[PDB]
Design an enzyme around this catalytic site. Structure first.
Site, mmCIF file in Angstrom:
data_model
loop_
_atom_site.group_PDB
_atom_site.id
_atom_site.type_symbol
_atom_site.label_atom_id
_atom_site.label_comp_id
_atom_site.label_asym_id
_atom_site.label_seq_id
_atom_site.Cartn_x
_atom_site.Cartn_y
_atom_site.Cartn_z
ATOM 1 N N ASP A 2 -30.646 -6.573 13.535
ATOM 2 C CA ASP A 2 -31.568 -5.585 13.317
ATOM 3 C C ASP A 2 -32.090 -5.768 14.761
ATOM 4 O O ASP A 2 -32.871 -6.501 14.673
ATOM 5 C CB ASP A 2 -32.052 -6.206 12.341
ATOM 6 C CG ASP A 2 -33.215 -5.261 11.691
ATOM 7 O OD1 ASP A 2 -33.218 -3.874 12.624
ATOM 8 O OD2 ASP A 2 -34.046 -5.480 10.825
ATOM 9 N N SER B 262 -36.922 10.811 22.058
ATOM 10 C CA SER B 262 -35.457 11.904 22.212
ATOM 11 C C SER B 262 -36.687 13.853 22.421
ATOM 12 O O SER B 262 -37.308 14.096 22.755
ATOM 13 C CB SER B 262 -34.913 12.225 20.323
ATOM 14 O OG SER B 262 -33.786 13.235 20.711
#
Length: 330
Positions: free
Chosen positions: A35, A199
């Site tokens: 994770d 992004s």
């Protein structure tokens, strides 16, 4: 040193991935959920409340000659999906894909929430976010990666998740045969303890690319792609009959649909998520309403590039003094 381990989807939807991990002496192999959005290595154990164990493999520290109680240390964690676990702490030898760390904090669960109990395939979590998020008190502990880092050939790990197929976590090297083209690296902020990056935009299907900064985290422990409501609405508007259902808890779409791809930007590069990766199947057995793999982050407080996004790429988690993230197509 290096390590290399195969990671395997837990079910036919790729809801999560499990990776075998050797703990203790002799080795006890547990299948852990790696994770990159958390920083605790915790396991089902001989200390876990019996009624909260249902099919998981447990770690038994008393059977490990290298286990030592970390006296006074406790841990307690709550995840974004509302699940939680807590317990006490041992140090022991932990190996992943041939890479060994001695003195790793292994957090033994005394209690786990129902979601963990109900998932027989996940024996615990191995956190790979920054150690500043580790929950052990009163002495915070380091992640497996942080402990391994100085010994690694290069201070990196890579995630290569499969679509309906096994993939690989590598530690200490970049497998140049595992991706196509070049890797594009992008800046990381560690201010919130995550692999947080920005992004450069998105496209829906064959549509034009929208240049827009989307801050979010690379999180292998989250199944879906959670993005701003504007972006998600633009995606689902291209699917006939798709709608957001408050009763179901997100966007659903007719199971008869063909889903468009979704592209996200990494610098000037582009990662394309095929439409099929965005199908999470019937909302309930036999339903003709299907659950979407792109959902709104509104009210999470952060955008999350979960498995839906990451499995479309070869992803480098560069833990050098100034960390960065790399993405390549594959």
């Amino acid at each position: 040193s290096t390590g290399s381990a195969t990671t395997t989807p837990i079910d036919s939807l790729d809801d999560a991935y499990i990776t075998p991990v050797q703990i203790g002496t002799p080795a006890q192999t547990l299948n852990l959920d790696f994770d990159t959005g958390s920083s605790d290595l915790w396991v089902f154990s001989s200390e876990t409340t019996a009624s909260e164990v249902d099919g998981q493999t447990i770690y038994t520290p008393s059977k490990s000659t290298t286990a030592k109680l970390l006296s006074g240390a406790t841990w307690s964690i709550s995840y974004g999906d509302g699940s939680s676990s807590s317990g006490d702490v041992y140090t022991d030898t932990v190996s992943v894909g041939g890479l060994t760390v001695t003195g790793q904090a292994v957090e033994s669960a005394k209690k786990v929430s129902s979601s963990f109990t109900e998932d027989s395939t996940i024996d615990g979590l191995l956190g790979l976010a920054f150690s500043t998020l580790n929950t052990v008190s009163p002495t915070q502990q380091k992640t497996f990666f942080d402990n391994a880092k100085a010994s690694l050939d290069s201070p990196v790990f890579t995630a290569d998740l499969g679509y309906h197929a096994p993939g690989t976590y590598n530690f200490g090297f970049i497998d140049t045969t595992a991706y196509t083209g070049s890797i594009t690296y992008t800046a990381v902020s560690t201010k919130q303890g995550f692999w947080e990056w920005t992004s450069t935009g998105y496209a829906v299907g064959s549509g034009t690319f929208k240049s827009t900064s989307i801050d979010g985290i690379a999180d292998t422990g989250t199944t879906l792609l959670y993005l701003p409501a504007t972006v998600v609405s633009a995606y689902w508007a291209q699917v006939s009959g798709a709608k957001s259902s408050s009763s179901v808890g997100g966007y659903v779409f007719p199971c008869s649909a063909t889903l468009p791809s979704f592209t996200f930007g990494v610098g000037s590069a582009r990662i394309v998520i095929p439409g099929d990766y965005i199908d999470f199947g019937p909302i309930s057995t036999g339903s003709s309403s299907c659950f979407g793999g792109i959902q709104s982050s509104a009210g999470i407080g952060i955008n999350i590039f979960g498995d839906v996004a990451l499995k479309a790429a070869f992803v480098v988690f560069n833990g050098a003094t100034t960390p960065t993230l790399g993405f390549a197509s594959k």
